[PDB]
A paper describes a structure:
ACO enzyme is a 2OG-oxygenase ‘related' enzyme that belongs to the cupin superfamily, which uses a non-heme ferrous iron (Fe2+) as a cofactor and facilitates the integration of molecular oxygen into a myriad of biomolecules. Overall, the structure of [name] resembles the Petunia hybrid ACO (PhACO), featuring a double-stranded-helix jellyroll fold surrounded by α-helices.
[name] interacted with [name] in the present of Fe2+, with a dissociation constant (KD) of 14.8 μM. We subsequently co-crystallized [name] with [name] or 2-PA in the presence of Zn2+, and determined both structures at 2.1 Å. In both structures, the Zn2+ ion is coordinated by the facial triad, including His180, Asp182 and His237, and binds at a similar position as Fe2+ in PhACO. [name] or 2-PA in turn binds to the Zn2+ via the carboxylate group and the N-2 nitrogen in the pyrazine or pyridine ring. As such, [name] or 2-PA would exclude [name] from coordinating with the metal ion, consistent with our kinetic analyses showing that [name] is a competitive inhibitor of ACO.
Author numbering: 6 to 303
C-alpha cells in the first residue's frame, strides 16, 4: 500500500518508526505522501482555488488553440510524442519570474510566493531527514546542491483536462525526474498520477491537504543508487481536470554532483558531473530510458 508518512510523529517517541518508514519509501517506492507537513491548510486551499480559476479564465483557451494547431482536436491514432497537458512555469530561485507572468493576479502572485518559500523550507527539512537516514552529516545534501548561486527552485503549474479518447494519449508520458527532490501539491479528487513499482502501475492517491514527495536522478547519483529515481506518468480521463502544482528543488547549475564517498564501497557505477550538463542532455531525451543518461556523463 502507498506510503503515507505523518511528519508530526517526528517530535516524540514514534520518531524512529517514522524515519524508518521514510527510508523504506525512499528505497522501495521513490515516492511517498506526507501529512501534517506544516503548510497551512488555508494556504493550500487558496493555491488550489486560484490555480483552477486561472486555468478556466486563461489556460483553457490556450490549450484548445494548441489542440487544433497540431491536429490533436481529433485523435484517431496513438500519440506517443505529445503530452495531453496544459502548463506554465514559475521560477523562484536563483531569480523569480513571478512578476513577469502577465495574466495572474496580485493575490495569486503573493500567495505563490508564500507557498514557494514554505515549500523550499520543507524541501530542506526533508533533505536533512534523508541525510540522517543515509548516515550523512546534517546539511550535506543542501551543501552539494548550493553550487555558487544556490539551488534552483521552480514550480510547474499544470492541468490535465478531459480527454475524449484517453487510450490514445497520455497526460504525461513515462519518465524519471532529472532533479533533486520534488514536492507535489496534486488534485485531491481527480486521480491520474501513477508510479511503476514491481511491474505494476500504481496510482498516487489523491489525498486532501497532502504533499507527494519523490526523488530525482540527482539523489540516485548522490546516494550511489541506494535511493532510485522511479518512473511515473499521468493518464488522462474523459471527465475531470486533474490539477498539479509540482515544485522542484534542484542543484544550482554549476553544482558538482557525485556519489557521496561514505556510500561508496566498491567503485561506483554512477558518474561525477556538473548539473547543467546533465540538464542539457536530459532536455532532449526525457522520455527515453534513464540509464543511458548516467552512462553518458562518463
Ligand atoms: O511534471 C512532472 O514531471 C511531475 C509532477 N509531479 C511529480 C513528479 N513529476
Ligand atoms: Zn516527473
Amino acid at each position: 500500500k502507498f506510503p503515507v508518512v505523518d511528519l508530526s510523529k517526528l517530535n516524540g517517541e514514534e520518531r524512529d518508526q517514522t524515519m524508518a518508514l521514510i527510508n523504506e519509501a525512499c528505497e522501495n517506492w521513490g515516492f511517498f505522501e506526507i501529512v501534517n507537513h506544516g503548510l497551512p491548510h488555508d494556504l493550500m486551499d487558496k493555491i488550489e482555488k486560484m490555480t483552477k480559476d486561472h486555468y478556466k479564465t486563461c489556460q483553457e483557451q490556450k490549450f484548445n488553440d494548441m489542440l487544433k494547431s497540431k491536429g490533436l482536436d481529433n485523435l484517431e491514432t496513438e500519440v506517443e510524442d505529445v503530452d495531453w497537458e496544459s502548463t506554465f512555469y514559475v521560477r523562484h530561485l536563483p531569480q523569480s519570474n513571478l512578476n513577469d507572468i502577465s495574466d495572474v493576479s496580485d493575490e495569486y502572485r503573493t500567495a505563490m510566493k508564500d507557498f514557494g518559500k514554505r515549500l523550499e523550507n520543507l524541501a530542506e527539512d526533508l533533505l536533512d531527514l534523508l541525510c540522517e537516514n543515509l548516515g550523512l552529516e546534517k546539511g550535506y545534501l543542501k551543501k552539494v546542491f548550493h553550487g555558487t548561486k544556490g539551488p534552483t527552485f521552480g514550480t510547474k503549474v499544470s492541468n490535465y483536462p478531459p480527454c475524449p479518447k484517453p487510450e490514445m494519449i497520455k497526460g504525461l508520458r513515462a519518465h524519471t525526474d532529472a532533479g533533486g527532490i520534488i514536492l507535489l501539491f496534486q488534485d485531491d479528487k481527480v486521480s491520474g498520477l501513477q508510479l511503476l513499482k514491481d511491474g505494476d502501475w500504481i496510482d498516487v492517491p489523491p489525498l486532501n491537504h497532502s504533499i507527494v514527495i519523490n526523488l530525482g536522478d540527482q539523489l540516485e547519483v548522490i546516494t550511489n543508487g541506494k535511493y532510485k529515481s522511479v518512473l511515473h506518468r499521468v493518464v488522462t480521463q474523459q471527465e475531470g481536470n486533474r490539477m498539479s502544482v509540482a515544485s522542484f528543488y534542484n542543484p544550482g547549475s554549476d553544482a558538482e554532483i557525485s556519489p557521496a564517498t561514505s556510500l561508496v564501497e566498491k567503485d561506483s557505477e554512477y558518474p561525477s558531473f556538473v548539473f547543467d550538463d546533465y540538464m542539457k542532455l536530459y532536455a532532449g531525451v526525457k522520455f527515453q530510458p534513464k540509464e543511458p543518461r548516467f552512462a553518458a556523463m562518463k
